[PDB]
Amino acid sequence: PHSLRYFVTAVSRPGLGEPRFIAVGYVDDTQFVRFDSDADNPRFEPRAPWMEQEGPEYWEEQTQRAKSDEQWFRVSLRTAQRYYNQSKGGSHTFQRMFGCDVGSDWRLLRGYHQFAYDGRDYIALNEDLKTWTAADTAALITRRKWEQAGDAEYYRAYLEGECVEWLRRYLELGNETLLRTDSPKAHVTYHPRSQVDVTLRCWALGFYPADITLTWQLNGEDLTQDMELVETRPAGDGTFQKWAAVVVPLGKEQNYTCHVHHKGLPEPLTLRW
Amino acid sequence: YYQSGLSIV
Amino acid sequence: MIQRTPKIQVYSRHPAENGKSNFLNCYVSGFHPSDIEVDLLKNGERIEKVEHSDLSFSKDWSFYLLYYTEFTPTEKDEYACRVNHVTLSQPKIVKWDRDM
Numbered sequence: 001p002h003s004l005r006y007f008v009t010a011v012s013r014p015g016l017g018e019p020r021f022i023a024v025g026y027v028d029d030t031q032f033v034r035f036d037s038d039a040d041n042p043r044f045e046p047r048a049p050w051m052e053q054e055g056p057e058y059w060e061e062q063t064q065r066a067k068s069d070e071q072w073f074r075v076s077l078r079t080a081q082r083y084y085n086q087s088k089g090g091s092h093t094f095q096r097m098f099g100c101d102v103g104s105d106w107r108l109l110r111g112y113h114q115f116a117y118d119g120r121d122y123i124a125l126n127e128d129l130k131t132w133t134a135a136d137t138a139a140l141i142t143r144r145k146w147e148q149a150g151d152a153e154y155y156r157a158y159l160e161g162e163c164v165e166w167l168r169r170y171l172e173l174g175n176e177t178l179l180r181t182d183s184p185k186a187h188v189t190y191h192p193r194s195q196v197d198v199t200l201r202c203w204a205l206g207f208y209p210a211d212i213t214l215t216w217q218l219n220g221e222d223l224t225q226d227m228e229l230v231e232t233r234p235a236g237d238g239t240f241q242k243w244a245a246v247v248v249p250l251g252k253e254q255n256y257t258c259h260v261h262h263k264g265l266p267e268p269l270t271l272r273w
Numbered sequence: 274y275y276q277s278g279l280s281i282v
Numbered sequence: 283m284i285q286r287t288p289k290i291q292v293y294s295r296h297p298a299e300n301g302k303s304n305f306l307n308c309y310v311s312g313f314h315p316s317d318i319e320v321d322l323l324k325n326g327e328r329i330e331k332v333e334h335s336d337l338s339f340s341k342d343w344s345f346y347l348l349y350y351t352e353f354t355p356t357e358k359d360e361y362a363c364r365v366n367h368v369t370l371s372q373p374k375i376v377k378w379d380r381d382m
Contacts, residue, residue, distance in 0.1 A: 006275060007337075007338045007339050009316060009337055009339065009345075011315065011316055011317075022336065022337050023275070024336045024337065024338045025275070026338075031335075031336065031338075034336045036336065044275070047336065062274075062275050065275040065277045066275060066277075068277035068278075069275075069277045069278055072277065072278040072281065075281050076278075076281055076282040079281055079282055080282060091315065092283075093314075093316065094282075095339060095343050097339075097341075115282070116343040118284065118314075118315075119283065119284035119285075119314035119315065119343055119344070120283070120284050120343070121343075122282075123282075145281075145282075146280050149280045151279050151280045154279050155276070158274075158276040162274045162276065163274065163276075165274075166274035189381060191381060191382075201381075201382075205297075230291060231289065231291075231309075231311055233291055233293065233307070234307075234309065234335075234348055235295045235296075235305075235307075236295050236305050236307060236348065236350050237295060241293065
């Protein structure tokens with residue numbers, strides 16, 4: 001499977017000028033473009049090396065769509081402020097996520113078009129790409145408006161056409177790097193914590209893609225009720241990092257096994273301290 | 274390929 | 283309107299070797315709103331020319347940022363991330379621990 005995503009944030013700053021608009025685009029776990037309204041000449045720019053050979057036409061159309069959306073968000077933030085009967089001086093946020101997923105055949109599994117206002121769900125297009133989910137009463141007003149105006153068909157036409165068509169093209173531009181995996185380099189570390197117990201940390205380093213499963217097991221049984229897990233973190237080179245830890249009795253280290261699942265690993269790893 | 278919004282919220 | 287306190291991780295791009303050039307990262311995630319302050323510290327003083335990623339958010343709409351500067355670790359130099367957010371009354375310092 002492959003994915004195309006755009007993460008769009010519009011934050012009004014009353015008294016500090018016009019709202020701040022950022023849209024950042026991803027294919028899978030690799031950022032490929034960004035637009036930031038506060039940049040030099042604000043425009044869509046390549047954020048991956050395989051994007052830099054695109055012509056002036058591609059960038060001008062992308063830049064024009066970002067500027068259209070920027071005005072759409074300033075209007076939408078003002079409209080939402082009236083919907084919620086909010087006062088004039090607060091900063092508020094609209095967020096929009098959109099993109100598409102493709103399978104082994106590289107045809108659309110699902111398209112996304114969903115919004116958050118002030119960090120919470122606002123309205124989302126359903127998997128049918130025909131109906132909307134309003135999170136609250138202000139979003140029911142929005143749902144009535146877009147259903148009458150046939151907004152769903154407008155996004156659906158993009159999701160079924162341009163989004164998949166260009167996501168497949170991006171897979172060609174970055175084929176040598178986007179389709180690669182880096183299997184995790186995994187190790188277990190040991191740190192004493194008491195005179196009674198020890199922390200065993202299972203490490204995974206230098207892996208792409210970001211998706212991974214780490215589990216600790218005792219005598220073949222998941223210890224996820226005792227696991228401390230951090231979020232998968234980016235190394236900064238395109239790879240990711242993660243660890244899972246269990247706290248176990250002194251002298252019991254060799255009874256615990258950590259298991260590693262990753263798209264680069266045909267078989268899951270079993271490691272011991 | 275980015276797409277711009279149509280109807281306002 | 284939700285407010286989320288961030289999660290903070292301070293770590294190196296590669297396994298830290300004294301005298302080997304490396305990268306120091308502060309990864310902050312799960313926070314709302316987007317406005318945040320992130321500084322990287324060496325011996326308590328703030329490190330200049332710290333780069334950061336383009337602002338993005340996850341499935342639950344909470345933001346994540348990566349703040350990074352190239353550095354060369356030593357035995358006795360101390361490094362940290364200092365984050366301030368609306369959820370945090372006082373600035374949060376998370377010390378860099380190369381084993382944790």
